[PDB]
Swiss-Prot record, chain A:
UniProt similarity note: Belongs to the glutamate-gated ion channel (TC 1.A.10.1) family. NR1/GRIN1 subfamily.
Membrane spanning residue stretches: 12-35
Source organism: Homo sapiens
Coiled-coil blocks: none
Domain statement: A hydrophobic region that gives rise to the prediction of a transmembrane span does not cross the membrane, but is part of a discontinuously helical region that dips into the membrane and is probably part of the pore and of the selectivity filter.
Assembly and oligomerization: Heterotetramer; the NMDAR subunits are modular and harbor tiered domains that function in concert to regulate opening and closing of the cation-selective ion channel pore. Forms heterotetrameric channels composed of two GluN1/zeta subunits (GRIN1), and two identical GluN2/epsilon subunits (GRIN2A, GRIN2B, GRIN2C or GRIN2D) or GluN3 subunits (GRIN3A or GRIN3B) (in vitro). Can also form heterotetrameric channels that contain at least two GluN1 subunits and at least two different GluN2 subunits (or a combination of one GluN2 and one GluN3 subunits) (in vitro).
Record note on modification: NMDA is probably regulated by C-terminal phosphorylation of an isoform of GRIN1 by PKC. Its phosphorylated state is influenced by the formation of the NMDAR-PPP2CB complex and the NMDAR channel activity.
Protein name: Glutamate receptor ionotropic, NMDA 1
Cellular localization per UniProt: Cell membrane; Postsynaptic cell membrane; Postsynaptic density membrane; Synaptic cell membrane
Consequence when changing residue 15 to R: In NDHMSD; loss of glutamate-gated calcium ion channel activity
From Swiss-Prot, chain D:
Section covered of the full-length record: 438 to 841 of 1464
Effect of residue 255 to E: Found in a cutaneous malignant melanoma sample; somatic mutation
Annotated consequence of substituting residue 115 to Q: No effect on localization to the cell membrane. Changed glutamate-gated calcium ion channel activity characterized by decreased response amplitude and changed desensitization without effect on response rise time or deactivation time course
Mutation effect (residue 139 to L): Unchanged function in ion transmembrane transport; unchanged agonist potency and channel activation by glutamate
Protein name: Glutamate receptor ionotropic, NMDA 2A
Mutagenesis or variant effect for residue 115 to A: Changed glutamate-gated calcium ion channel activity characterized by increased desensitization
Gene that this sequence comes from: GRIN2A
């Protein structure tokens, strides 16, 4: 009766994931701008 | 026997702490100091633009090898910058160690013979039922 | 202080740190401080703190004083004499129920064992008694290589990494180049000796590099934990500490035998045992015992707070411990009922309030 | 106690409201010990003992007026109070102290206190550099610049292009030197973390007349002087010197508890008052942000006592009983039952390493001077 039952992770990864996604997403536009600047100069 | 019960705070941190927990003002000052070091290296170097692209900022970051030395003065300044980087690394190492040691701030009250909960407070309203054997 | 006078017999050659005259007195101090010798009651030169207070009394109250060394040295406890059942005192206040007496000046604790027959005065310095222990050098010098870690386990992981290098060389077909590359990647070097063509070899090398980084992290974390968590220093804290309470036949701690606190521990039924322990171990001095504690002969020693604090402060060799108990102060001793009681009291009180005790104590102790 | 009928009406009644505490405790214990009875009551007019044109506002005067034998409370031995009456041998030590409270956390960053700038690691660094140079020369069987680059590089960090190996022995020596360097870095990180484990909050003033307590206006900050009218500390502070006295009257607000409440956040930071009372106040203070920076510094080390008459037949027995109580070990238990505080006995920042940056900045300026030599030839 009395007693039958007895009772370096992803938490650091959410912000890192957000920052990595933000940095990766805008890379194409920055490379295009650099290519345009090189072409114009 | 008689014993006391308490709630628990399941979360403790987020593991995603930025440089602001060290100090946000420290982060801004560190960025300013890094910019100053890079500007000083670029000024003393005069490669040129090609050197300044990856002379010290990458070197201060990690080992890329894309720096163009200008004089032995540049080498001495780079050794000094490496020492400063190691100092910052050890400082943030001790910072993280202090945070790890400092975790779990609350202390579980080991009974009422402990005066802590025996001392009346304006924060704890702990009690039992009315009209009990206790 | 008892520093013998100059060879001419005249006390001299004494100046303060800030630069000022130093007051000492001659006083008939028998050089035969040992218990039993041909008596030589030579007048030695003596000074210190209570001498200065007596001089302050002389400057405020007009009188003449003849300070002399006690023939006994014992502070005075009731003692039934041998082959008899008659109770009597001894030592300094054993002289009180004797001839000259008439005055008592020494570091003396407010105590009930003698207060029945005599009266004290108001106290001028409040301090009790505690415990001291000899010291040893720290062992956290980090001199050894793999002592915080396991040297055997370090050998095991070194053999493991050597076997890993050999296995990598087995897949080189270059082999010497591959071994050099592995050893360089062991320490995050990147020399570049070995780049075998096979992609599987490169993948295995990257995996081994990650594993080496992890192993180094584990080694440094274990060493850092061993260094940070190193604190094996722990002495007895308070009378209630059982190590102090348990009488061990290996290490012995004692106090001054037959001196003030002997009755303080003889009256009480709680302690009892350590009183018996000190009965065969408490010494009859205040300096031989303190030099014997550092001699790795006495585990610890119990005595007046100020005495031991000063003795440890002068020579940075030992540290006292334990919060003060049996709190009290020092008061001046008299005989019977001299009218000077109220005058002495009011004088010490006025001096203490005004701010002269602070200067004198800071100067001398 | 007697209460006046409301306030305006001088008449009143002797209301009763039970009282207790350590002085009450010791009172009861001595009462059992000596086997006497008492009708204890409370005083209202004035407080403590201080002649006002040879007028003592009750308390002590209650003993000299032959109006009451025994009067035990918050008793302070002093000069003028040591002749109107006769006291009892004390059993508690306490005097005057300061109770300054700082605004927020105070710690020592120890930015320059790294084990460097000494002769401990300097000798090891010199020996390691000499060994590395000797090994480079041996393996040699331009070069000087590359050797200097290697020595400076794999000491702090390999985060710089200094790659120039020669032979297998060169690789072995580089591996050994890198192992030593990373061991040194790990040891330094561990040592700085261990320093972070320790702390330093030693003191702020360390003296009752050190520098500010001569002319607080001259020092610039006028530290509050919230003493108490016709109290105990005031007589002695005036007696020692009037330098604090001329500014003592600048502030005298309310009782000790109200004074600490105000000084916690209101106007003041430093407080001077009796020792044991402030000890108890600070021990139980909320958050222990109110702690005296004196490490227990006292100018009036004295004792309590009982307010006997001028020869009433109570001195001998009271003294014997009190010494028996202290020796037998009772009011230690009473004190730990009553007097003990809350904390009391139980116990990468911007500015933290800021200064060395400037020093490093100064070091940077040194390099500029070297450029002059580079421009010399």
């Amino acid at each position: 009766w009395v007693r039958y039952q007895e009772c370096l992770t992803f938490e650091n990864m959410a912000g890192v994931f957000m920052l990595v996604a933000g940095g990766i997403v805008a890379g194409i536009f920055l490379i295009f701008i650099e290519i345009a600047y090189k072409r114009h100069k | 026997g008689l014993t006391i019960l308490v709630k628990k705070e399941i979360p403790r941190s987020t593991l995603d702490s930025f440089m602001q927990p060290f100090q946000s003002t420290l982060w801004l000052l560190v960025g300013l100091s890094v910019h100053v070091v890079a500007v000083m290296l670029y000024l003393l170097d005069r490669t040129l633009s090609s050197a300044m692209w990856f002379s010290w900022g990458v070197l201060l970051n990690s080992g890329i090898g894309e720096g163009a030395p200008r004089s032995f003065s540049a080498r001495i300044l780079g050794m000094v910058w490496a020492g400063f980087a190691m100092i910052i690394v050890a400082s943030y190492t001790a910072n993280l160690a202090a945070f790890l040691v400092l975790d779990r701030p609350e202390e579980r009250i080991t009974g009422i013979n402990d005066p802590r909960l025996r001392n009346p407070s304006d924060k704890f309203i702990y009690a039992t039922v009315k009209q009990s054997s206790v | 202080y008892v520093k013998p006078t100059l060879s001419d017999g005249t006390c001299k050659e004494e100046f303060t740190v800030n630069g000022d005259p130093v007051k000492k007195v001659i006083c008939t101090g028998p050089n035969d401080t040992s218990p039993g010798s041909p008596r030589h009651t030579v007048p030695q030169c003596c000074y210190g703190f209570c001498i200065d207070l007596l001089i302050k009394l002389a400057r405020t109250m007009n009188f003449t004083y003849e300070v002399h060394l006690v023939a006994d040295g014992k502070f005075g406890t009731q003692e039934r004499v041998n082959n008899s059942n008659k109770k009597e005192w001894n030592g300094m206040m054993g002289e009180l129920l004797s001839g000259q007496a008439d005055m008592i000046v020494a570091p003396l604790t407010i105590n009930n064992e003698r207060a029945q027959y005599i009266e004290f005065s108001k106290p001028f310095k409040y301090q009790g008694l505690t415990i001291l222990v000899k010291k040893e050098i720290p062992r956290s010098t980090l001199d050894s290589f793999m002592q915080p870690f396991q040297s055997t386990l370090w050998l095991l992981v070194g053999l493991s990494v050597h076997v890993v290098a050999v296995m990598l060389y087995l897949l080189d077909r270059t082999l010497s180049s591959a071994m050099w590359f592995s050893w360089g990647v062991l320490l995050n070097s990147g020399i570049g000796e070995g780049a075998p063509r096979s992609f599987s070899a490169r993948i295995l090398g990257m995996v081994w590099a990650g594993f080496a980084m992890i192993i180094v992290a584990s080694y440094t974390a274990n060493l850092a934990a061993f260094l940070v968590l190193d604190r094996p220093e722990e002495r007895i804290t308070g009378i209630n500490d059982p190590r102090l309470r348990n009488p061990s036949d290996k290490f012995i701690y004692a106090t001054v035998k037959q001196s003030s606190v002997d009755i303080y521990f003889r009256r009480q039924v709680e302690l009892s045992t350590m009183y018996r322990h000190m009965e065969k171990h408490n010494y009859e001095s205040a300096a031989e015992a303190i030099q014997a504690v550092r001699d790795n002969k006495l585990h610890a020693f119990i005595w007046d707070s100020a005495v031991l604090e000063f003795e440890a402060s002068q020579k940075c060799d030992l540290v006292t411990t334990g919060e003060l108990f049996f709190r009290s102060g020092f008061g001046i001793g008299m005989r019977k009922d001299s009218p000077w009681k109220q005058n002495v009291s009011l004088s010490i009180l006025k001096s203490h309030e005004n701010g002269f005790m602070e200067d004198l104590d800071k100067t001398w102790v | 106690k007697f209460v006046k009928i409301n306030n305006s009406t001088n008449e009143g009644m002797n209301v009763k409201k039970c009282c207790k505490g350590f002085c009450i405790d010791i009172l009861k214990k001595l009462s059992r010990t000596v086997k006497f009875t008492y009708d204890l009551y409370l005083v209202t007019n004035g407080k403590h003992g201080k002649k006002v044109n040879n007028v003592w506002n009750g308390m002590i005067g209650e003993v000299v007026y032959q109006r009451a034998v025994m009067a035990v409370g918050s008793l302070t031995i002093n000069e003028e109070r040591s002749e109107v009456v006769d006291f009892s041998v004390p059993f508690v030590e306490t005097g005057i102290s300061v109770m300054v409270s700082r605004s927020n956390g105070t710690v020592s960053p120890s930015a320059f206190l790294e084990p460097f700038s000494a002769s401990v690691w300097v000798m090891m660094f010199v020996m390691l550099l000499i060994v590395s140079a000797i090994a480079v020369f041996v393996f040699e069987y331009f070069t000087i610049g590359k050797a200097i680059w290697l020595l400076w590089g794999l000491v702090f960090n390999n985060s710089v292009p200094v790659q120039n190996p020669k032979g297998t022995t060169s690789k072995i020596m580089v591996s050994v030197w890198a192992f030593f360097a990373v061991i040194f870095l790990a040891s330094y990180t561990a040592n700085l973390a261990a320093f972070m484990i320790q702390e330093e909050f030693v003191d702020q003033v360390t003296g009752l007349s050190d520098k500010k307590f001569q002319r607080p206006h001259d020092y610039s900050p006028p530290f509050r002087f919230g003493t108490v009218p016709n109290g105990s500390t005031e007589r002695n502070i005036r007696n020692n010197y009037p330098y604090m006295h001329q500014y003592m009257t600048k502030f005298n607000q309310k009782g000790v508890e109200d004074a600490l409440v105000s000084l916690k956040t209101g106007k003041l930071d430093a407080f001077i008052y009796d020792a044991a009372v402030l000890n108890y106040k600070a021990g139980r203070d909320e958050g222990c942000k109110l702690v005296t920076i004196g490490s227990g510094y006292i100018f009036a080390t004295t004792g309590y006592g009982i307010a006997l008459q001028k020869g009433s037949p109570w001195k001998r027995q009271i003294d014997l009983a009190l010494l028996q109580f202290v020796g037998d070990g009772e009011m230690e238990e009473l004190e730990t039952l009553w007097l003990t505080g809350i904390c009391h006995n139980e116990k990468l920042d911007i500015d933290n390493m800021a200064g060395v940056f400037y020093m490093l900045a100064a070091a940077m300026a040194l390099s500029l001077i070297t450029f002059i030599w580079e421009h010399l030839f």
